Subunit: 282 residues, 3 copies
């Protein structure tokens, strides 16, 4: 069996480097050549105790694209609830407001795997996976990358996980651009230091745009098209979404915008995971 | 190569008479011979930004009847941005929004992922008009030479206006407008009818014209309800072919005793939404349709 | 088949023969699934009142037969007009509504589209799941010794299951409930008229050795010390304190399997309603 078979996917950290690369190869394959019947006859529950239209739609589309059916709730004793649901369905995609809830479901779901679509505000494994997949797709690699992370690096959910994931690769250089009150926390700088991974701090984008392979904008530090003069041809601008004012609309039609394509990649990342946890061979 | 392939469907007034007849011929064909695998392997987003259960269920049913999957929501970020993301996911988008205009939204997207307007901020609801048209055509055999009355609020319901505009692309139609003064069909509609030399007349009551009607279209205050409600007694002296239509819901405009008459066709009309909406989805997503 | 295009308003309206057909069908679908039986069918799931467990079970059942689902999970136009419209869209309607008699009202306006009642007002298809489970495990629905424990007064679950089992032969009911929560006199009257044996008790041990089935609605594993080998403990759920978690460990534990059996019992109902054979 592939190593993820009937494995609960709760945290991105619970995947080894080998496991990430597997998911990513699988996602690339599915994007290139769809398998509309891979999960035929499977029924997957979409349990969004917490509403999250964007993530739910992505997961449901992923499930349908693999030929499986979806039953669920789009908004709201868990132990027993999951002990019952798990008697009906082949997998459970869960989103819940309290961190630890997905793991709890997992303690009771038996051989039915739980795929976490978000557990509290920080743990979002498929967001990290789609971020990684997008960097891989656009740059051809996850090593030797110049990546900037801009905005709120203190309460930025997706950005801590992303940094930790990329830190497992070789030769990356992180450029952290944030207000002092919202700097990337110390424990993250600490691990980068201990892994001998290069990072640098800058007051703004202007000065480092020429160096970047990826500009990751978090939810003055607003990005506008004018700021992208001198960019590398391979530069991609990412944002986990939604954006409000941090990326002006004029960026959208430059060759560097890739936030919508990045969201679109969520389908492949999520299909790959569903495929791997439900099919022993692949 | 069909003219609606990879085209957004936003306002019914954007379709020519030829395009309207294509949609209707396609709807009639799907009513007679379903094609449950036509959109096999397609995923269609059902994006309802306000609850609109009847219209949403009709669209989702239509999608399934063609063999496609449905993803959606049945009830901040710009709408453009929401659709930019969803457009990367799905093959087509059904969109209902109580505030935003479907026209502005659609102008920003190519029709490679067609957007079908299920009702927007400007009150454009093209598939309501299509199903009304299909219902007149299938019960009367034609969309020309129809005597049609529109009764109730003719000022503020856009769907009665769009139906009038669409019917005015055909010949020999006679419109009977029955409304209180405060709710008169607008002058912008009457001027168009005169320009085209389309006959219309105003009446204070339904009872004056029932005998000559082919279609009685009832629209969706104490005085107004009081004297414009339709009862089965009102239908004595009617043509055999008369059909009573209503976009729904009817609360008080049509008494339940009309439901058993041979003329009641508002539920069948609603059922015709399935074929009109299937036809549209079929046409925007398939170049060739045989 | 006798349930073809019939409305299923009440499991209690079904005869012994019809119950047995639903149960044979259920057993057949559990053993050998028919994932395309209802291919190209569209079924409405109209949950006016939310009931997540029941709705998910019905929707899963629908997808397991290859049919599509449209509907709503919760939610002035008459119910009559709403159903007059929905019945023009779909092939069958599963509905749950807070008004007593809603599904029967709906059935008056749905033409030839069958209505399956998932619960009107004071509510249940739970009785089918219960029957199927007893049959599956006990190999029969006749000569069964069954104990119902808890609140027998307001427990419409036990009422409908008692009514259902009373359609079978030689069943023996052991009613265990607080004095004030007694199985109502009108139910006992029905058993007495049918010459169906029942007995009243104050406690659950002391009867365990005689049971084929123990139906809960205060148990512990210690209580089933001298249980019969074929015994099964059942509970419709959602449980709270009635059954302890150490009973989940026991080998007579069958409430989750019972719950999982909803899929087959509900698929069976829908298959029979929508297919001649």
């Amino acid at each position: 069996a592939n190593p993820l078979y009937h494995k609960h996917i709760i945290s991105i950290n619970d995947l080894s480097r080998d496991e990430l690369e597997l998911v990513l190869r699988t996602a690339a394959s599915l994007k290139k050549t769809p398998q509309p019947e891979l999960l035929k006859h499977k029924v997957i529950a979409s349990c969004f105790f917490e509403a999250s239209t964007r993530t739910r739609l992505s997961f449901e589309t992923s499930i349908h694209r693999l030929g499986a059916s979806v039953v669920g709730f789009s908004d709201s004793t868990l132990a027993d609830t999951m002990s019952v649901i798990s008697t009906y369905v082949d997998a459970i995609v869960m989103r819940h407001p309290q961190e630890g809830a997905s793991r709890l479901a997992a303690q009771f779901s038996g051989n039915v795997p739980i795929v976490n679509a978000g557990d509290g505000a920080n743990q979002h494994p498929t967001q990290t996976l789609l971020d990684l997949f997008t960097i891989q797709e656009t740059q051809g690699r996850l090593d030797n990358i110049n990546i900037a992370m801009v905005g709120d690096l203190k309460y930025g959910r997706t950005v801590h996980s992303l940094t930790q994931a990329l830190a497992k690769f070789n030769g990356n250089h992180f450029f952290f651009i944030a207000p002092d009150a919202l700097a990337m926390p110390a424990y993250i700088l600490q691990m980068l230091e201990e892994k001998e991974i290069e990072y640098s701090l800058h007051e703004s984008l202007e000065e480092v745009v020429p160096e970047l392979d990826i500009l990751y904008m978090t939810r003055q530090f607003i990005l506008r098209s004018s700021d992208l003069t001198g960019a590398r041809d391979n530069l991609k601008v990412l944002h986990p979404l939604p954006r409000i004012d941090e990326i002006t609309t004029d960026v959208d039609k430059t060759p560097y915008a890739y936030y919508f394509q990045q969201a679109g990649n969520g389908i492949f990342a999520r299909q790959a995971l569903l495929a791997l946890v439900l099919n022993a061979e692949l």
